[PDB]
Paper text:
The calcium calmodulin protein kinase II (CaMKII) is a multi-subunit ring assembly with a central hub formed by the association domains. The AD hub, which evolved from bacterial dimeric enzymes, extends the β sheet to form lateral contact interfaces (LCs) needed for ring assembly, while the ancient dimer contact was preserved as the vertical contact interface (VC) in the mirror-symmetric two-stack hub. Linkers with variable length and sequence between isoforms and developmental splice variants, connect each AD with a peripheral kinase domain (KD). Here, we present near-atomic resolution cryogenic electron microscopy (cryo-EM) structures revealing that hubs from the α and β isoforms, either standalone or within an β holoenzyme, coexist as 12 and 14 subunit assemblies.
Cryo-EM maps of 12-mer (2.6 Å resolution) and 14-mer (2.6 Å resolution) were also obtained for the β-isoform. The superimposed structures of the 12-mers between α-isoform and β-isoform had a root mean square deviation (RMSD) of 0.35 Å, while that for the comparison of the 14-mers between the two isoforms is 0.3 Å. The 14-mer hub structures from the β holoenzyme and the isolated β hub superimposed with an RMSD of 0.52 Å. Parallel simulations on tetramers extracted from the β 12-mer (β12T) and 14-mer (β14T) hubs gave mean RMSF values (β12T = 0.11 ± 0.02, β14T = 0.11 ± 0.01) comparable to α14T (0.09 ± 0.03). In contrast, the tetramer δ angular distributions extracted from the 12-mer and 14-mer hubs have substantially broadened distributions relative to the narrow distributions of the 12-mer and 14-mer parent hubs. The δ angular distributions for the parent hubs are well-resolved from each other, whereas the tetramer distributions were superimposable with a mean δ angle intermediate between the mean values for the parent hubs. Importantly, they suggest that the 12-mer and 14-mer have comparable stability as their δ angle curvature deviates slightly higher or lower, respectively, from the most stable δ angle determined from the unconstrained tetramer sub-assemblies. We constructed an open ring hub in-silico by extraction of a vertical dimer from the β 14-mer hub, We simulated this assembly for 100 ns following analogous simulations reported for the human 12-mer γ hub.
Numbering used by the authors:
A (entry chain J), B (entry chain E), C (entry chain I), D (entry chain F), E (entry chain G), F (entry chain H), ...: 408 to 542
Write the structure that this text describes.
Amino acid sequence: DARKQEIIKTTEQLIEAVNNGDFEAYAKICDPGLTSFEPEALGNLVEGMDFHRFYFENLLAKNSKPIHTTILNPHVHVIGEDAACIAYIRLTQYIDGQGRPRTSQSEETRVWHRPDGKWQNVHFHCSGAPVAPLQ
Amino acid sequence: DARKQEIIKTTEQLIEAVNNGDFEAYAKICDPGLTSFEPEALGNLVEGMDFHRFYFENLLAKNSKPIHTTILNPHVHVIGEDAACIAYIRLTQYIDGQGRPRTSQSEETRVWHRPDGKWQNVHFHCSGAPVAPLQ
Amino acid sequence: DARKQEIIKTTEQLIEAVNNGDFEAYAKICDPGLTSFEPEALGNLVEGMDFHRFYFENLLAKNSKPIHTTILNPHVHVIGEDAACIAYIRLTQYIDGQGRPRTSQSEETRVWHRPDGKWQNVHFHCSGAPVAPLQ
Amino acid sequence: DARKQEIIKTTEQLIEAVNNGDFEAYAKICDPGLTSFEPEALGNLVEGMDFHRFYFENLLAKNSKPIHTTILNPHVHVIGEDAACIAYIRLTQYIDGQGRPRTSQSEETRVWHRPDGKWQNVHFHCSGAPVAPLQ
Amino acid sequence: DARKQEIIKTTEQLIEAVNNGDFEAYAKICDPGLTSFEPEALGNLVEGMDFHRFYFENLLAKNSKPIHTTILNPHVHVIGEDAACIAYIRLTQYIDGQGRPRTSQSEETRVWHRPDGKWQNVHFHCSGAPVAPLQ
Amino acid sequence: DARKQEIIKTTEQLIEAVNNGDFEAYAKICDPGLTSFEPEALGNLVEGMDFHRFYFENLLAKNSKPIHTTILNPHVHVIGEDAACIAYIRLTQYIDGQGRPRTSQSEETRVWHRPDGKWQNVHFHCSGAPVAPLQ
Amino acid sequence: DARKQEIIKTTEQLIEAVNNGDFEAYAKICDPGLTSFEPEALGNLVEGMDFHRFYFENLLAKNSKPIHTTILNPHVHVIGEDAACIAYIRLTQYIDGQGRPRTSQSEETRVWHRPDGKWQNVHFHCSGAPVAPLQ
Amino acid sequence: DARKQEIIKTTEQLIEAVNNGDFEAYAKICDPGLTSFEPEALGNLVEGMDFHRFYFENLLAKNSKPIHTTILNPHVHVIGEDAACIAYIRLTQYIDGQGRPRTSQSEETRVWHRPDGKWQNVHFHCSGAPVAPLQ
Amino acid sequence: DARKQEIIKTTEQLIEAVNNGDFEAYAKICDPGLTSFEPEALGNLVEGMDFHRFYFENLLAKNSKPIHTTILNPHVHVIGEDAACIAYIRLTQYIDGQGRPRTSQSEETRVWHRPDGKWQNVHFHCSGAPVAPLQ
Amino acid sequence: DARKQEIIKTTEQLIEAVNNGDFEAYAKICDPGLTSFEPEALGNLVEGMDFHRFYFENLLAKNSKPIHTTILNPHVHVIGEDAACIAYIRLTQYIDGQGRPRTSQSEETRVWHRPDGKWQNVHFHCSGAPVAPLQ
Amino acid sequence: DARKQEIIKTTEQLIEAVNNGDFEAYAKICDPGLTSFEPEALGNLVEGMDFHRFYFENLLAKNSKPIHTTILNPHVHVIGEDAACIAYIRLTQYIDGQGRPRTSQSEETRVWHRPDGKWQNVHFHCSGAPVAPLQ
Amino acid sequence: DARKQEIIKTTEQLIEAVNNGDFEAYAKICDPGLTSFEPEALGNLVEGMDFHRFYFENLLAKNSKPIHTTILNPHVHVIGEDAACIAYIRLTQYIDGQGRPRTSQSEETRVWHRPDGKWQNVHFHCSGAPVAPLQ
Amino acid sequence: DARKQEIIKTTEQLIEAVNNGDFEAYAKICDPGLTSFEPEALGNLVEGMDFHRFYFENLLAKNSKPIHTTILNPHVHVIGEDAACIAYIRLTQYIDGQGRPRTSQSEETRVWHRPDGKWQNVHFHCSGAPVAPLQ
Amino acid sequence: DARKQEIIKTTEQLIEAVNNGDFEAYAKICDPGLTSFEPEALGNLVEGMDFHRFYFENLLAKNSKPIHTTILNPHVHVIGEDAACIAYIRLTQYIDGQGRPRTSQSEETRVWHRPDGKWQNVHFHCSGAPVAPLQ
């Protein structure tokens, strides 16, 4: 019961740092050796922070229109005291370049480790919609 | 060094059970609560074994043509003594319905847990090519 | 006779609160645990009010052009004293971005429950046209 | 707890009578005044059994290939002692006219009433895939 | 009440004579000066029986596969003792040239007159699907 | 001879009230229970005046360009002293958004009843061109 | 009255000689200097019988499937005692190469002269469908 | 010889009244019961002057750019003292909306009668290009 | 009068030698220095007989189906006693590979010279349809 | 030798009068009974000067951009003392509506007669490019 | 005069060795260091005989259907006593895979040198049609 | 060795005169009887200077943007003391109408003769890209 | 001079082992750590022999039709006594599935090292055509 | 270990000189005889610096928007003391002409030689994306 709810809590804090363009908070949540699969990387496994830094600097820190995000049907696996995995469906509501409301879907997996009494993200996999909305 | 190589060993034993259509060996490797994201499930999170059983019975146990599989650039995260995560690129070589050799690519993540001294799979995510080849 | 007409009355009061962008009246008509199937949710079952709040804030409270709505062939099922179901065809007449009159169709089911002597909506299903008109 | 599980039980017994082409069992589960929205009815509300009887006689009682069905994320509303509503996502796995395995999705709502101590279906709404698979 | 039901009765007897290819029964129901608008006449008003006789002789008397017909939402206007008008939606279920079940829709108006104590059809208008199904 | 000419007279007075956008004259010609089939209603039977009121308010009372209308080959059925039916082809000549003259065709049926010594319209069916011209 | 009916009589006798492939009867009805506009002549004015003789020899005398023809709304101009003109719409019902019934339309003008007490055709113009049906 | 040349003379005077937009001269040349087949009438036979009056008022009396017309290969049939028929190919040269010279073709039949010592047109048939040029 | 008719006579004798595949008669009609423009020569001026000999040997001497040819509106220029030019429209009626009758058009110019008291062809130009029909 | 060069001389003087828009010089070179085949006449044989006068007045006398013309491979037939024929390929270089240089090709035949000691053109045939360039 | 005709003679002997598939005669005509530009070499300069040997062995020595070749407008440059260049247009007539006669065009340049008293080919360039006909 | 390098030297001096629009230098390099095959001449052999003069006057003397040219793999044949042939691949780098750098390819053959102690060009053949770049 | 020719010799021996399907000779030429870029590997760097073994077993050892290969413009870099690099264009001539001769192009780089007195291949890069021909 | 890291160091210094448009630093890193395969050269092997100089002058020295580059999975072969080869995947992140972030991929091989104690590049091969981004 209580152990699964803190993995939901850290996952929601991560997603809001990305919404705000808050790269300084986002960098505290990630392990420096973090790896990623996502639609922007063209089928390659990316490692470290500098691929994501470009989207913070050239996009996410600049934009300011309303967005709403929903997490659907989260499933949590707990792998002892120091490791967890979460999988969920993500729906995004956003405003397009004509001012009309639109919707998109992605499927996401996140893997969490507990060094030094702090939860940090070690691997991420994303399917479906790109992170940049087609406004 | 030695701990990462046994996660490669169990991952290669899993992939060959699927190639052989060996559902009885495959069922020993999986946790009964296993969850999955894959191209056949249309963006839904599937749970348990019975969605996969259909592909064993109606396809993988029947087919017999030559296939070759390559694992490229595997990255392993070790999360204490009892948990691990592996991510890799998979290339498949197969023969089409005209008899011509063809190639396809997928991106895969697998999450492993160590109950009772035996490694078992708890979550899987797949991107790119479907598991049924377009022969 | 008289019991079916008050289910038509609450259904017509609901549709007009949406036409007016009156989120404060709409929130009194809905159970807090309300679930929905609709074309905007991409085949997912949505729960609660916050998915709909976005369309009130970014669209329905802002727009002001003439719209007319017709309810065709309503069928009512009465399931004791405290529960009812209504199903109907909905035609919408609206003005497009060039100023021309246009028409669209949807099929709708609504499920009603009577806690505390007040009728409240518990589930909704929609087919056909989206709620945002293609002006 | 226990009351929601018998609404899942009757819903699973209904779906299997349709899979088997068992019109005599299906006719005991339905109220004679049953209404329906579905993709085959071209946006019209159908009433009674004779629209469905045609698919039993000309299709479902004749076919015999393997099919598998999954119910995802069922949500149940209980509306006193004698009424209930269930909503879920349905995945179908089937074999096509070339012998290849395929998958399709629908969204379904079912409304249940308890006359004479027996649960019977009074209204049904379906979205997404047709009931006849595109083999 | 009772007067509207005999206009439904004659309308259902007319439609079944066409289903059976029974030109001798159909010719007793029609006034010899009958006029028609229908999709086969290319936007022209047809008069008399000989345009319809061709579809009896070359098609409707020859075919023998299962068909089912539904009349939806019939509205009846009664214009004294000797005249009536009926309007309705018609759904047809039929088997195609591959043996698959299919559905089509038309909108129909029929005008009835009561010479010599017998109801006879004087004008007909049809919209939507052709009378020959696209098998 | 003389009885058919007054059904042509009322039909021509109806069409000119629509050309002028004169909803107050049009409302005197129609029975309050009037039903309609037309291309704007998407295959549904409409009842009463309020579906048509929208086209008077948002279009027909606003527009002012030249239009010419021709009634071709009218056929009249007389069904005693108090009822009649008329069927005809309608050609419309109008000016488009570039200022060029254009032509369109429809097929129309109108049913007339004589309550209180005044002819009133009880049912209407239209095929072919929409009532809003594609300027 | 009676003079217009014999121009309808000769026009119906002409059309049936073409249906039968009876070139010997057709040649008695035509003036030897007859001229023609028709879709087969590619926008050229043809003169005499030998252009039409080819369709008798290579087609109309060989074919034997059922055809039905309707003359709609014939208008007759009478130009003294010895000359007349007739204009009408022609509908053809025929069976295609798959055995299905089909319909086509043409517009026709015929000019008649009365040498030697016998009516003969001097000019013909045709629009719309070709004389060879697209079976 | 001389009788055919006055039918060419009246035909050339008719075509120039249309070029000039001179409806008052055109109305003296036509019989009040004149009938027409032409591309603008959508396959219908038109009667009288008011269909043509619209093209005089909204187009032919307004336009003023250069046009040239050629009559090719005129064939004349003379049907006693009081009736004639003429058939010909018509080529039109005109300037488009970009200022470029363009060409179009039609095929025309005209039927002439001699009441009261004045030649008047009783029927007209046109094929090929519309009378409104595609500038 | 009489001089133009012998240029029509030699032109008709030439066209029939080509229809028959009679290269020995065709070679007597042509000057050995004959030049040609035609659709088969891809925009090049051909000289002599050997380009045409290939169509006699590989096509025109082998084929045997019915063909009919019409010469329309021939214009003849006479350039003294020993030279003439003829220009005309040619219509061909032929049977296609399915057995259906078809029509095609060409425009032709022929230049004639009178050495040794015999008319011979010195130049030819063709536009429109190819000489090989698209059967 | 010398006789062929004066037919080249008159042909080059004709082409330059058309380039200059010099209708008064062009009219001295042509016989009043001149006939023509060309791409602008839609497959019809034109006679006289007035079809060409329109292109002088509305185009060739107005335009002023650079054009260059080449005559390739001219072949001359000499038919006594008073008649000649010339055939050649014509290449035109011109500037388009964007200012870019472009090229087009035509095939041309010209027939010359020598009345009154002056060479005049009696017939012309053109294939390939139109005379109006697609600028 | 006489020197240009022997360059035409060797060029015609070369083309016939290729038509016959006579690689042994063709190899005597070519310098061993011969270079080529042609459509089969994909924009590359080829050197020597072995690229051409493949078309002799796998095609030109096997085929046996009728072909005819024309050389148009040959231009010869003579560069002293021992060197020449020839340029010409080539038309090929051939029979396709359905048995129909077809035509194609190429542009060709050939460079000739006179070692040891024998003319031999040193360079070749080809444009337009491929050497393998599209049968 | 040294003799091949002066044929490269004259070829590079020719290409730069064209780049500069220097028609006066270009005219000294060419024989007055020069012939050409190139993409602008539509498959015709051109002779002399005036076809090329148009591209100097209307284009090459006007333009001024940066261009770079590369000669790849030049092959030289030497045909005594007074004649040579050169063949090469040409790559052009240029700036388009949006300011972006682009690349194109051609294949070129040039034939050189040595009258009066000066090398002059006698024939040219070009394949691939046009000389006017698609900016 | 002599050192570059033995790198051409080993490169030609490698290409012929692949043509013959001689995997046992091919395996002696390659370093066991060999890496590859090629069109079949979908943009991935492959390592070792087993990716290539599949094309030997399922294709190259089975096929037997004629193929010819040309190496164009080879450039060799020599990097001391024990290392070399070669780059070239490769043209392949082959017979398709209809028996027609076809051509394809690739660009290739090969890197050679001299361990133990034997030249072995350490890296390969390929662009353009796939190694499996599109027969 | 240490020897492979200085080949990564020189490769990263090369890529940054190109990013900066620093042709003077780039020219010190390259051997004057450098050869290249790349997408801009249309399948040709380029030699020397002047093909690349054009992209420095007309593009890379002018542009100034943000770009980020990643080197993935570099593999290094060491071929004695004085020669090395490196192969890698390159990902580029850039801003398009609308200001949106975009990604592209290439595959690259570089060959390094150590004359005079300084590493210099001797050959380069590139596949996938062009070096000019499609902004």
